Design an enzyme around this catalytic site. Sequence first.
Site, PDB file in Angstrom:
ATOM      1  N   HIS A  91       1.116   4.582   1.792  1.00  0.00           N
ATOM      2  CA  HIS A  91       0.769   5.235   3.022  1.00  0.00           C
ATOM      3  C   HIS A  91       0.815   6.748   2.826  1.00  0.00           C
ATOM      4  CE1 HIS A  91       0.649   1.888   5.935  1.00  0.00           C
ATOM      5  NE2 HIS A  91       0.920   1.345   4.792  1.00  0.00           N
TER       6      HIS A  91
ATOM      7  N   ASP B  22      -4.797   1.646  -1.525  1.00  0.00           N
ATOM      8  CA  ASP B  22      -5.000   0.191  -1.378  1.00  0.00           C
ATOM      9  C   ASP B  22      -4.709  -0.532  -2.667  1.00  0.00           C
ATOM     10  OD1 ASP B  22      -5.902   0.467   1.274  1.00  0.00           O
ATOM     11  OD2 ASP B  22      -8.003   0.459   0.647  1.00  0.00           O
TER      12      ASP B  22
ATOM     13  N   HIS C 157       0.772  -1.207   0.000  1.00  0.00           N
ATOM     14  CA  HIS C 157       0.000   0.000   0.000  1.00  0.00           C
ATOM     15  C   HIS C 157       0.837   1.309   0.000  1.00  0.00           C
ATOM     16  CE1 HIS C 157      -1.884  -2.861   3.113  1.00  0.00           C
ATOM     17  NE2 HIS C 157      -2.591  -2.964   2.012  1.00  0.00           N
TER      18      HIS C 157
ATOM     19  N   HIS D   9      -9.244   2.605  -0.078  1.00  0.00           N
ATOM     20  CA  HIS D   9      -8.403   3.812   0.157  1.00  0.00           C
ATOM     21  C   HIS D   9      -7.697   4.074  -1.157  1.00  0.00           C
ATOM     22  CE1 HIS D   9      -8.098   2.325   4.623  1.00  0.00           C
ATOM     23  NE2 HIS D   9      -9.051   3.233   4.528  1.00  0.00           N
TER      24      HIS D   9
ATOM     25  N   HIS E 216     -10.962   0.540   4.119  1.00  0.00           N
ATOM     26  CA  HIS E 216      -9.956  -0.273   3.429  1.00  0.00           C
ATOM     27  C   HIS E 216     -10.571  -1.270   2.495  1.00  0.00           C
ATOM     28  CE1 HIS E 216      -6.270  -2.564   2.859  1.00  0.00           C
ATOM     29  NE2 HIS E 216      -6.981  -3.646   3.154  1.00  0.00           N
TER      30      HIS E 216
END
Lengths: 151, 151
Positions: free
Chosen positions: A46, A81, A44, A78, A69
């Site tokens: 961040h 994701d 992912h 997200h 999520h």
Amino acid sequence: ATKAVCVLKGDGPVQGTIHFEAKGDTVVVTGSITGLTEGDHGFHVHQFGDNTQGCTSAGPHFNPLSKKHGGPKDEERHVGDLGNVTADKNGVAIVDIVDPLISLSGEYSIIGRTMVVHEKPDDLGRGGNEESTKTGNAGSRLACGVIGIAK
Amino acid sequence: ATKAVCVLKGDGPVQGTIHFEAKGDTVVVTGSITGLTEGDHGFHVHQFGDNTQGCTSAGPHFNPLSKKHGGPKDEERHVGDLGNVTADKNGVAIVDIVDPLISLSGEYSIIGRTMVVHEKPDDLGRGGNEESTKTGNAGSRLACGVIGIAK
Ligand SMILES: [Ca+2]
Ligand SMILES: [Ca+2]
Ligand SMILES: [Cu+2]
Ligand SMILES: [Cu+2]
Ligand SMILES: [Zn+2]
Ligand SMILES: [Zn+2]
């Protein structure tokens, strides 16, 4: 910016280089990660490109739209994701994802943010626990890097 | 982005953390670098946030207006030319720069690019050889980091 690059590194042996390229209204993510236990690992974007406290200060998944999520193919996911990468028996994960949500420019721009590779597989928010709807239960962050502009 | 951060790391002992903050219409760069030899060291924003070949793949100085190298106070300078930082006798350099050309968004954004600390003093484009007009004769890249978004 139309090309980006990330060099993943952590406290351990996981290490890898991910390339991003904007093709149309999608971003094509490629590269390889090594030193991974065979199997699926949460992969992912961040929120922060802050590596001052290792992968920890990268914050939560980049979620500009405040959704829950999900996995890459879901609508409720997200922006960061990108699901899972899969290490083979030799611990090597070959990344090849095409994502229509992450961007190399504009509001969903992930330039300056951190790519994190997790210990466990992303349960894609289909885990049946709160945690699953927040991080997919991907557990610890093995390696991470700030995503930078590439030539 | 109104705050950015960069962790400098190299093959040697030089390391540090640089913070950037958009305050008003300007950008304040603060932080400290350790492990340096006493004296001045060129400190510039390089074009690419590509750490795939260490600091070498960061490319040349970030120069969207295609000018020659100069000092931070010159009109004729690259956007990434932040002059020199100065290490005390213990190898510590305290960074405190306000710069009018870099930004944390838009055309002059340095998010996703690389902060480099050099081996020698930057001659501010006045050494008189062609190299001075490109890199200030600042020499090799001791440490570097991709500039990321901070919280
Ligand atoms: Ca874990
Ligand atoms: Ca040198
Ligand atoms: Cu994650
Ligand atoms: Cu330089
Ligand atoms: Zn997520
Ligand atoms: Zn320059």
